[model samples]
Target: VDESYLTFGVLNEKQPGFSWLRVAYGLDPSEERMRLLLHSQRALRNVLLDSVDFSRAKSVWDFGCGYASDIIALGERHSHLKLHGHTLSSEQAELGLRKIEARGLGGRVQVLRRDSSKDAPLESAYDVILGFEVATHIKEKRSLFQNLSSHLREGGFMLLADFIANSGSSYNVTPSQWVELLSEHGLRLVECVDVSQEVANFLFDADFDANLTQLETSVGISAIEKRNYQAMRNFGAALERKILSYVLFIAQKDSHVRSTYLRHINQKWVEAPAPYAAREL
Candidate 1:
């Protein structure tokens, strides 16, 4: 059950194939190819983090965090914030803890090995919760949302980047389904953007085939590793064909006062200003 071998140890430094789980946002164009790829990864992280107002946020949780990179970065960026990361892989949790210690973020950030779909690892609620492509791997999404919702404070934000099935595929969850699910859990959708084209472009720019070949020639990747590579390519193809969609959703746990006022004004009668011709000088 241990995924220690899949961690690929230090080979990740040379081969980017190991960290192909998350989608990249190719926003910057000035850096070199490899650096640009890394930059795009960070850019995507920033886009997710920027969904919430961090100044008011005191705690954040990353559900199904892989290697805890996002939480570590968040700890560095916001020293006052308490961060928690949960991953199913013990190997990834250990590696993430090591990275957190090396970065001197042991007190601010903590990574634990836990099944996010089954339980809420932390008793304390968080101001923001993030899940980057985690739902795709999970079968019981209802449980996942239930745990996430229970651990999220009212008025908190839930930012997720995931793949949604546009057609009849294994990933049967659609955008409307996500909205309904979130609403059922007392979360309202603030925004939902279809970023399938952006993901497709990023994969094309990353050139996964070339990277896989390089890894194969250098260290002779295992069948599992090769399959992982193929999966990324297939995701890109699915995205390109519109059979699948990559989406970013920003949802809030409760309806804010401002939102309620806006709704009231739109739904109910409101006073109107006098005409310009009838106005006093």
Candidate 2:
């Protein structure tokens, strides 16, 4: 009933996106469900702004941004802080653009559909770049960082907030090895921190696996559900998007690096098992 919600926070109405599923929102205020969704997004934004320079942020471009009321809100709250979003899902991007128009923030925001890892460098860009919950969807994680660095202005910040394995083990290099990858991409780590503690207790009690099993049972699973299930089923895949909510470093691009090299592993890179972005990328 509050103005801060509904009009400001409504996302794609179909099944959930990562942002939606990231936190199971309060469908029932009586059940205190309000906090589940609230806390997760709050934690997500906190991590993003903690290391990145939001005060100087003139614009933000979200890679793999689906159903993006989050960035829209950021645009509205911050003076002259425009927002931009990109996704492989034309459907989702169109939906987000519709909202941007509906909100009358058209001058301050835009959403595009593209593969962020491939060609994120357009003529116009943003000061802050973020990829929320979409990191696991990337077939080439290293390329993601490099492209992000390529697009950001010198001294600009890049934020990566997604699920990650809670281990330094090689079994899941994506969670930690990514820190190195980002620095390699030219975005030096100002903060390669962890936010797993917030979700660790939730994971054990949450039925993420159960939801995946249900989708697997239903042969008519939505593409998003199928992707979610597949990622959780695989060890490395699950490590990046499930197992843990890996709040990673806020890396800064110090060099004039413009191109990110792609490293295609023989296994999953070829299969490209439908991950977090099955709807498109």
Candidate 3:
């Protein structure tokens, strides 16, 4: 597998966009980019893992698990966990298998080439399911959610990091619509955090032109890769214009009961006194 062609890295949550550019360049621009890329990717993974409770989790599934990086990392940290990854790309599956073997996690972590929306897993159920930037690509979100929900054990959690259409966006589904769709599949939204600005900031700072040019000079890109690059640029533009939002949604399966704590939190905020106007004072 050609490591250079693999899709790697996640947007950094803490650092403002462009901070990485200030660091001294390594042997080449690509080398420096790879360093920061993996660093930011790790940070994003940490943020995602921290947002959910994994104390009691014994099994996990990562839908659209490109290269199976997150699951491999999780397998390393949690010896008791049985991690499974699903991806459509055969290349990624091969690479993931190699990675798992190299890390001596072959028995604990498995990456299978399967369509997550339709395929059944070897395990009947999992304690947690994860999807990163997956929902936006699949047209049949209902089926995807249904599959995820069916595989999730009762009280299990599903965590998704994906793009959602905001008002006036070209995309079809809105944030509220996403919540409704999940509810239809027996998943209740527990928390949602919007990180559109953070993602857009990072995309804006990313040296796409330089990176693409470097690739063109070295390996050359195909039409699909060209389109992907254009799509990423457009994603940044859409986010900047507020036409789209990057969000993290943590939901639990078959948990329809409303959160009493959240209800009171909202009530308390509403009951707070408003600031007085200068004229009234």
Pick the TM-score winner. 3
In candidate 2, position 40 carries an lDDT of: 44
| Candidate closer to the true structure by lDDT (higher is better), 1 or 2 | 1
Please state the error at residue 90 of candidate 2 in Å: 1.1
lDDT, candidate 3, 45-99, per-residue tens: 5545775556689899998888888888788988889999999999889999999
Candidate 2 regions off by >4 Å? Answer: 1-31, 52-55, 123-125, 163-172, 206-223, 226-245, 256-281
Please list the Cα RMSD from the true structure of every candidate, rounded to 1 decimal place: 10.3, 10.2, 7.1
| Residue pairs of candidate 3 with colliding backbone atoms | none
Greater lDDT among 2 and 3 belongs to: 3
Index of the highest-lDDT prediction:
3
lDDT for each residue of candidate 1 in 1-281, tens digit (9 for 90 to 100): 11211221111123343233222212222335435456556554555566777889999999877888778877898889999998988878899999999999999899988889897767569999988888778888888889998889998999887777766473458655665567667776665555566566555425566656656775576796689668767877887798887766677787453555433332221112121122212
**Per-prediction TM-score to the true structure, in the order listed:** 0.77, 0.66, 0.78
- Assess the local accuracy of residue 10 in candidate 1 as a C-alpha lDDT between 0 and 100: 11
lDDT string, candidate 2, 2-65, tens digits: 2112111111122222222223322223333344445444654665576655677777888877
> By the lDDT metric, which is better: model 1 or model 3?
3
- Residue 79, candidate 3: C-alpha displacement in angstroms: 1.5
* 10 residues in a row with least lDDT, candidate 1: 4-13
What's the lDDT for residue 204 in model 3?
64
